[PDB]
Amino acid sequence: DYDALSCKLAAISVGYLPSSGLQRLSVDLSKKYTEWHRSYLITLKKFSRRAFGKVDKAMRSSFPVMNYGTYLRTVGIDAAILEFLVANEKVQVVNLGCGSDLRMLPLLQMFPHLAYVDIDYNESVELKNSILRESEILRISLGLSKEDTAKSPFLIDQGRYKLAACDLNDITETTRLLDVCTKREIPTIVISECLLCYMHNNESQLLINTIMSKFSHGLWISYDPIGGSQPNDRFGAIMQSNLKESRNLEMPTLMTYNSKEKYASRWSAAPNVIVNDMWEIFNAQIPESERKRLRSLQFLDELEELKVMQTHYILMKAQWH
C-alpha cells in the first residue's frame, strides 16, 4: 500500500494530478485534492517514521514513465466512476482494498446522495483512521471529530462515509459487513484497485460471484496487472521474483490471467464486460489537450517503455442488472 501512496503523491507534486477535466473537479476541489493528499503525507510522518521514510524516498526517486502509469490508473478508474454517478444520483460505493485512497473526499462532496464504504485489512484501516482524525483539513472534509466515536466493526461512521476492518479472503466476514452498511436495491460500484492480484484464485472468484449476486444493479471497476500473453514475455516472471525477493509477497493469478480477455472472463456472469489495457486508454480516452499538458511537465524519453509497462495493466468494467 505504501507503493500506491508513493505513486499518487509523486504524480501530484509534479503536476500530473489533479486533472480537472477527466476527474470533473471544480476550482476549489482541485486545490483540495492537492491539500488533502499533502496533509496525508505530513500526518503519516507523525504516526510513522518508517512509513514516511519509504514514501518520501520513493516519491523523489519516481521516473516520468512511472508517473504516466499513475495518471492513467487514476483518471481511468475516475472516468468509469463519474459516468455511473451522474446517471444515478443515489449510489453506494464499496472500495475493496482501499489502502490510502482519498477519492471519497471529492466524490462525497460532488454527489449529495452518495454513500461510501472503505474496506481493508485491520492494520491498514487503523492507520487510515488515525490520519483522517488527526489532520484538521481531512477532519473537516468528512465532518469527523478527533476522538474515536464509532462502534463495533466501523472505525468511522459519520454521515455518508464508513471505514471498516475486514478480511476480504474470508467470505463469511465480507457478506456480513455488507449487510449492515449497504442495501440490495441501491445501485453499487465495487472498486478492487490492486486487491485481486495478491489473492489466490479461490478467494477472488468467490468474492466476485458473491458481491455481484448480492446487489441487483452495479458496476465493478477492477484495476490489476497481467503477466503477458506473448511468447518470451517474462514481465510476469520478473515481477513475481521482485515481490518475494523484496518484502515476501505473492501474485498467485498473474500468469493464469495473462491477457485482458482471460481477466475479463472472471466476470463472465455479468452480461456487459468491457476491458482495455492502459496503453489503449492513453491513446483513446485521454484527450489531445491532456497529453500536451503531461509533455510540459516531464520528458517522456522512452514511449515504447511506457507501452511495455502499460499493456501489462488493465481496467475491467463489468455491469449487471
Side-chain angles (χ1 to χ4, degrees):
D1 182 41
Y2 295 152
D3 186 55
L5 180 62
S6 302
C7 294
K8 199 78 86 344
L9 299 163
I12 290 158
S13 188
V14 173
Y16 287 86
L17 300 166
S19 167
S20 60
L22 300 169
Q23 304 189 128
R24 307 190 194 195
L25 299 169
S26 60
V27 173
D28 291 7
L29 284 175
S30 288
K31 180 180 177 153
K32 294 255 186 73
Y33 188 94
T34 302
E35 288 177 320
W36 283 328
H37 292 211
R38 282 168 73 76
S39 196
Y40 200 92
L41 179 64
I42 290 155
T43 304
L44 174 61
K45 190 186 142 290
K46 186 174 167 135
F47 280 109
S48 201
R49 179 182 160 78
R50 191 191 304 101
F52 175 78
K54 296 181 189 125
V55 169
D56 178 62
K57 297 171 205 196
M59 266 201 315
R60 282 135 23 84
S61 70
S62 188
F63 287 95
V65 162
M66 292 146 51
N67 296 323
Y68 262 82
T70 310
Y71 166 85
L72 295 159
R73 170 181 164 185
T74 307
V75 307
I77 293 165
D78 276 317
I81 288 159
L82 292 160
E83 195 175 296
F84 196 88
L85 294 183
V86 165
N88 304 270
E89 114 183 88
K90 195 171 178 188
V91 172
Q92 70 201 341
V93 174
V94 179
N95 204 321
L96 307 170
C98 68
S100 308
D101 198 2
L102 305 176
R103 70 169 26 115
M104 77 268 182
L105 303 184
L107 284 174
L108 285 165
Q109 174 54 33
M110 286 157 62
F111 296 97
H113 296 6
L114 170 67
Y116 206 102
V117 187
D118 273 327
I119 305 178
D120 213 13
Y121 271 122
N122 194 262
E123 284 82 47
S124 298
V125 301
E126 278 280 6
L127 177 55
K128 182 178 210 180
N129 179 43
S130 300
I131 291 158
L132 294 162
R133 287 191 180 286
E134 174 54 48
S135 177
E136 198 188 316
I137 195 172
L138 295 169
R139 261 212 319 284
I140 293 156
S141 67
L142 296 164
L144 297 170
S145 78
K146 191 149 181 188
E147 289 89 68
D148 294 14
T149 58
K151 292 116 185 280
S152 300
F154 304 107
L155 294 176
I156 291 168
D157 193 8
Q158 260 272 214
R160 301 171 290 117
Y161 176 63
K162 286 179 159 60
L163 185 55
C166 198
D167 182 27
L168 291 171
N169 292 118
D170 205 314
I171 201 77
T172 298
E173 194 183 338
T174 300
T175 52
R176 286 171 168 182
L177 173 60
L178 290 170
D179 288 319
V180 296
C181 68
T182 61
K183 318 261 68 156
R184 173 174 290 276
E185 74 274 323
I186 296 166
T188 301
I189 306 184
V190 190
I191 308 158
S192 68
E193 195 180 18
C194 315
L195 173 74
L196 304 174
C197 64
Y198 300 114
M199 293 161 62
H200 293 255
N201 194 245
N202 268 254
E203 276 63 60
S204 60
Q205 193 65 61
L206 184 56
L207 186 62
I208 287 157
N209 297 333
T210 299
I211 283 164
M212 277 203 297
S213 297
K214 250 222 176 291
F215 306 112
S216 299
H217 189 194
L219 157 64
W220 203 306
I221 307 157
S222 188
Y223 178 90
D224 264 330
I226 57 170
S229 65
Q230 299 299 320
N232 199 52
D233 192 357
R234 301 183 301 96
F235 174 94
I238 271 142
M239 184 155 70
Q240 283 182 314
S241 301
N242 277 24
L243 249 294
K244 174 155 158 190
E245 210 174 357
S246 56
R247 307 108 60 188
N248 202 254
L249 248 43
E250 267 189 309
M251 281 194 190
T253 65
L254 190 65
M255 301 311 307
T256 303
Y257 302 118
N258 69 353
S259 54
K260 73 193 192 201
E261 291 91 29
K262 288 179 197 192
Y263 190 98
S265 70
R266 297 152 85 174
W267 290 265
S268 60
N272 183 34
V273 181
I274 299 161
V275 68
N276 297 282
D277 61 89
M278 308 312 296
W279 175 251
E280 294 182 315
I281 285 163
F282 176 55
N283 298 306
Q285 297 186 16
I286 305 309
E288 180 54 39
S289 65
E290 284 284 293
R291 280 143 80 183
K292 191 181 184 205
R293 204 179 47 73
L294 302 196
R295 276 199 291 283
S296 73
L297 302 175
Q298 290 184 316
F299 285 107
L300 188 75
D301 299 317
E302 313 303 309
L303 181 64
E304 178 59 35
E305 288 181 359
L306 182 64
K307 180 176 161 174
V308 168
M309 185 168 78
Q310 292 295 285
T311 44
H312 300 54
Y313 289 95
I314 54 98
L315 183 67
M316 192 276 315
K317 301 186 288 189
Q319 287 208 67
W320 62 98
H321 207 152

